[PDB]
Amino acid sequence: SGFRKMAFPSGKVEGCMVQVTCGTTTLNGLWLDDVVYCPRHVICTSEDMLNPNYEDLLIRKSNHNFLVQAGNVQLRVIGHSMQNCVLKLKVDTANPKTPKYKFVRIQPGQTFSVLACYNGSPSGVYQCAMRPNFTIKGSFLNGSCGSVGFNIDYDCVSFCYMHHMELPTGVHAGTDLEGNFYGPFVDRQTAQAAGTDTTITVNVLAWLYAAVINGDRWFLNRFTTTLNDFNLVAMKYNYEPLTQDHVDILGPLSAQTGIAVLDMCASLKELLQNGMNGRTILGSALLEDEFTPFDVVRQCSGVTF
Amino acid sequence: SGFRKMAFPSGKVEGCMVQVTCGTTTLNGLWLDDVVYCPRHVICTSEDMLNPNYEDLLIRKSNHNFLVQAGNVQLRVIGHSMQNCVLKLKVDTANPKTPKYKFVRIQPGQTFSVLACYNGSPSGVYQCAMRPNFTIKGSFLNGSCGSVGFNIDYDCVSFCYMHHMELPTGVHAGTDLEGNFYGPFVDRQTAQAAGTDTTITVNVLAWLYAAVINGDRWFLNRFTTTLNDFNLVAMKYNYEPLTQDHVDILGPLSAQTGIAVLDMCASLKELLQNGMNGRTILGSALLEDEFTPFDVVRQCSGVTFQ
Numbered sequence: 076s077g078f079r080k081m082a083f084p085s086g087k088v089e090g091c092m093v094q095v096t097c098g099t100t101t102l103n104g105l106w107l108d109d110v111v112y113c114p115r116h117v118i119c120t121s122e123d124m125l126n127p128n129y130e131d132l133l134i135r136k137s138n139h140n141f142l143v144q145a146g147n148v149q150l151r152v153i154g155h156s157m158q159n160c161v162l163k164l165k166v167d168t169a170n171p172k173t174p175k176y177k178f179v180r181i182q183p184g185q186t187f188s189v190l191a192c193y194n195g196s197p198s199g200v201y202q203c204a205m206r207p208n209f210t211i212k213g214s215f216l217n218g219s220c221g222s223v224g225f226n227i228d229y230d231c232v233s234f235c236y237m238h239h240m241e242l243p244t245g246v247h248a249g250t251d252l253e254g255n256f257y258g259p260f261v262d263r264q265t266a267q268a269a270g271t272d273t274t275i276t277v278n279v280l281a282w283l284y285a286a287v288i289n290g291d292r293w294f295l296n297r298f299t300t301t302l303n304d305f306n307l308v309a310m311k312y313n314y315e316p317l318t319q320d321h322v323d324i325l326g327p328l329s330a331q332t333g334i335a336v337l338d339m340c341a342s343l344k345e346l347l348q349n350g351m352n353g354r355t356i357l358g359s360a361l362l363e364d365e366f367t368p369f370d371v372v373r374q375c376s377g378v379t380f
Numbered sequence: 381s382g383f384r385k386m387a388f389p390s391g392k393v394e395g396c397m398v399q400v401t402c403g404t405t406t407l408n409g410l411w412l413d414d415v416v417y418c419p420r421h422v423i424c425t426s427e428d429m430l431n432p433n434y435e436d437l438l439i440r441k442s443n444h445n446f447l448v449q450a451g452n453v454q455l456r457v458i459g460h461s462m463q464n465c466v467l468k469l470k471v472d473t474a475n476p477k478t479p480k481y482k483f484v485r486i487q488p489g490q491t492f493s494v495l496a497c498y499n500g501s502p503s504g505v506y507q508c509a510m511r512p513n514f515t516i517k518g519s520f521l522n523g524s525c526g527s528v529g530f531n532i533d534y535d536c537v538s539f540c541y542m543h544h545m546e547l548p549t550g551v552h553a554g555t556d557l558e559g560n561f562y563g564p565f566v567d568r569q570t571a572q573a574a575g576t577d578t579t580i581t582v583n584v585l586a587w588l589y590a591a592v593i594n595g596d597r598w599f600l601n602r603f604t605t606t607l608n609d610f611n612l613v614a615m616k617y618n619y620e621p622l623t624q625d626h627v628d629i630l631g632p633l634s635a636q637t638g639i640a641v642l643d644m645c646a647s648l649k650e651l652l653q654n655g656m657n658g659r660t661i662l663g664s665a666l667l668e669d670e671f672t673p674f675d676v677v678r679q680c681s682g683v684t685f686q
């Protein structure tokens with residue numbers, strides 16, 4: 076029993092974190108086999124950051140410009156290149172702790188664990204979601220750049236996020252591990268802002284199912300709805316549209332609890348139109364949207380890695 | 381910026397988790413040096429969970445009645461002893477991944493990370509607090525027993541909790557790593573139930589300081605309060621008493637933000653009176669009480685967003 080915001084165990088990732096230093100700038104890198112991955116903005120000076128020519132800054136650099144530290148051991152850099160917004164430093168030693176891994180690009184609404192690091196040292200782990208506006212509501216201080224986000228499947232780490240920068244509202248922007256940004260952001264000091272966000276409907280429904288599994292049922296009702304009628308309500312309340320694929324993905328939880336997705340949609344419709352009337356759901360007074368259907372099934376079934 | 385429920389990196393504990401089987405029962409153990417720690421109720425029979433006598437049950441066991449599996453390796457048990465409600469199995473191999481560690485018994489209101497495990501394998505990590513009623517609001521399924529809670533300040537793992545059982549409201553009870561239960565609970569099947577719980581006041585105040593550090597002041601007011609008037613009011617909402625020790629603990633956050641502790645108490649009194657009027661604090665619409673003062677200082681910037 077119980078239901079918590081839960082992260083993946085972080086050990087396989089902890090063994091990959093290194094410190095990367097270029098000039099006066101230090102941040103984190105991801106050491107996998109004989110390559111260290113980090114944000115290319117490590118090579119920027121205060122001056123370059125307004126309008127960096129990354130092509131030209133990089134050719135100006137040489138291998139010896141980069142200091143890579145794995146705990147107390149210096150790793151010797153023997154090559155360097157850029158892929159999109161990620162710098163790749165070839166080192167002379169393959170990481171003996173490299174896990175089975177893949178680089179994956181996630182979709183808005185999907186969740187992942189973040190291992191927050193400073194000076195190459197893991198500091199904390201938390202769970203978060205890729206927002207519909209392609210930001211993440213992280214917890215990151217100066218020097219957190221290069222921290223990564225990931226999911227695990229059995230023994231395989233799927234790296235999906237590398238942290239690059241903070242936006243004015245205090246949310247965060249980054250790339251996949253191939254250096255492609257999530258969202259319409261650029262790695263330079265310029266006017267950029269998070270766009271208006273929306274709530275991840277399929278995840279709210281998954282969490283309502285989690286609540287029912289855990290005994291919270293006051294919001295259930297006799298009514299059902301249709302996708303079209305519900306999506307007009309969703310649009311009204313700045314919720315993402317619910318697609319047929321979402322309904323199918325929630326099909327498991329629907330059979331276990333007896334609440335068809337469109338039955339549960341009728342509960343959510345009423346919660347949106349009328350509020351919670353002073354009650355809570357799973358210990359929250361807000362509708363929580365950072366649990367995916369798979370997160371709920373995994374936590375409610377005890378999947379291990 | 382931002383503010384999350386943040387656990388410690390779990391790798392140092394993952395390397396200690398094993399599976400212990402006795403008879404038909406499997407649960408988790410903690411392998412440190414040449415000892416595996418687990419709940420002594422692993423030796424309880426299915427036919428008598430109401431009044432086990434653990435001394436009599438254990439004297440009947442041979443070392444080979446305990447099966448310990450570390451990943452794909454069977455560890456040989458070469459001795460056993462019981463300490464309070466914890467069983468200590470001596471094994472023939474020391475864990476080569478044993479971290480620097482200590483055992484600490486914590487006080488209500490303290491927080492820690494939990495590595496939830498099944499069959500000796502980690503499932504996930506989350507943050508908990510020891511509630512005033514000596515339960516934790518965990519997320520634990522059948523067979524989670526022997527999962528542990530811990531902090532890792534300054535690269536030393538302080539183990540403070542071993543999970544033993546689920547209570548009727550779905551909250552959780554367990555021991556320190558010396559096998560003494562938190563609270564009045566016992567490791568047998570009884571009618572035991574958690575007491576009425578209360579809100580951890582010093583932690584709510586810590587979290588309000590976090591909100592100010594991260595740039596949000598909307599809930600402050602022009603008033604102050606005496607400590608005794610604050611407690612008289614707060615207890616009417618089932619908040620724990622705030623002690624002078626708590627006021628001292630909040631000194632650093634008060635200094636960083638320029639908000640006197642009793643002025644933040646006055647803000648909390650008004651929030652209890654008024655609610656949030658459709659606003660949120662650090663993304664929550666309720667007052668959060670599972671961040672300690674130490675936790676806030678660990679996570680938040682040293683410079684207030686004025």
Ligand SMILES: CC(C)(C)c1ccc(N(C(=O)c2c[nH]cn2)[C@@H](C(=O)NC2CCCCC2)c2cccnc2)cc1
Binds near residue numbers: 119216263
């Ligand atoms: C060069 C570039 C792209 C402009 C940049 C500059 C600084 C950083 N930030 C580093 O802390 C940092 C950089 N190198 C080592 N640390 C921080 C950051 O985003 N402030 C932004 C402030 C607005 C203008 C853009 C930069 C940061 C803080 C907290 C959490 N995340 C990141 C990130 C990117």
Ligand SMILES: CC(C)(C)c1ccc(N(C(=O)c2c[nH]cn2)[C@@H](C(=O)NC2CCCCC2)c2cccnc2)cc1
Binds near residue numbers: 421523546
């Ligand atoms: C023998 C004893 C002390 C009565 C006992 C029995 C079972 C367990 N529980 C094991 O799952 C378990 C035991 N051994 C392997 N798994 C579970 C548990 O507490 N149910 C309780 C149900 C009410 C009566 C007391 C036991 C459990 C479930 C979810 C999370 N936490 C634990 C714990 C203790």
Ligand SMILES: [Cl-]
Binds near residue numbers: 127128129130
């Ligand atoms: Cl460029």
Ligand SMILES: [Cl-]
Binds near residue numbers: 490
């Ligand atoms: Cl303590």
Ligand code: NA
Binds near residue numbers: 107108109
């Ligand atoms: Na590789």
Ligand code: NA
Binds near residue numbers: 295296297298341
């Ligand atoms: Na309904």
